[PDB]
Amino acid sequence: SKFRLLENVNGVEVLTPLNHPPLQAWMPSIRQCVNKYAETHTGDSAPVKVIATGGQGNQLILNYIHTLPHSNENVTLRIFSEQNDLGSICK
């Protein structure tokens, strides 16, 4: 259950399990998703981290984790490589 840091995106740690396969190809999508998620989650409600997994086919799982007082905002989201609804999937 140890994570490696793919990237810090505007204060949000984008993490993946230590030995998870490579995800670099998803980074532009992940960055857009984090950008859009920040639009509805600011200040104390900003997520601490997002765990990225999957992505070996056309689907990536992003788990946004908040501080404990804001853990009711934690979400698992699924994004596709081809589809382009990041503005509405990532709120």
Residue numbers in the entry: 200 to 290
The authors write:
Several Vibrio species use ToxR to mediate bile resistance, and a few pathogenic species have co-opted ToxR for virulence induction. While over-expression of ToxR can lead to ToxR regulon transcription, under physiological conditions ToxR requires ToxS, an integral membrane protein with a periplasmic domain, for full activity. In wild type ToxR, these cysteines are known to form either an intra-chain disulfide bond or a disulfide linked homodimer, which is present when toxS is deleted in V. cholerae. The disulfide bonded ToxR periplasmic domain consists of 5 β-strands and 2 α-helices forming an α/β fold.
The dbToxRp from V. vulnificus, which shares 55.2% identity to the V. cholerae ToxR periplasmic domain, readily crystallized. The crystal structure of V. vulnificus intra-chain disulfide ToxR periplasmic domain (Vv-dbToxRp) was solved by molecular replacement using a selenomethionine (SeMet) labeled structure to 1.25 Å (Statistics are shown in Table S1). Given the two structures are essentially the same we focused on analyzing the native structure. The 5 β-strands are arranged in a β-sheet with one side packed against the two α-helices, through hydrophobic interactions. Interactions of note include a Pi-Pi stacking interaction between the Tyr236 from α1 and Tyr263 from β4 in the hydrophobic core of the protein. A sulfate ion was found in the structure, stabilized by the side chain of Arg203 and the amide nitrogens of Leu222 and Gln223. Finally, the disulfide bond between Cys232 and Cys289 covalently attaches α2 to α1 stabilizing the structure. Interestingly, the density of the α2-β5 loop (residues 281–284) was poorly defined. In addition, the α2-β5 loop has the highest B-factors in the structure. Taken together this indicates the loop is flexible. Therefore, we hypothesize a major role of the disulfide bond is to stabilize the structure, and importantly the ToxS binding region, by constraining this flexible loop as well as the relatively short helix, α2, which follows it. Interestingly, MatchMaker35 aligned the VtrA periplasmic domain to dbToxRp with the lowest all atom RMSD of 5.5 Å, suggesting despite the placement of VtrA in the DALI search the VtrA and ToxR periplasmic domains are structural homologs.
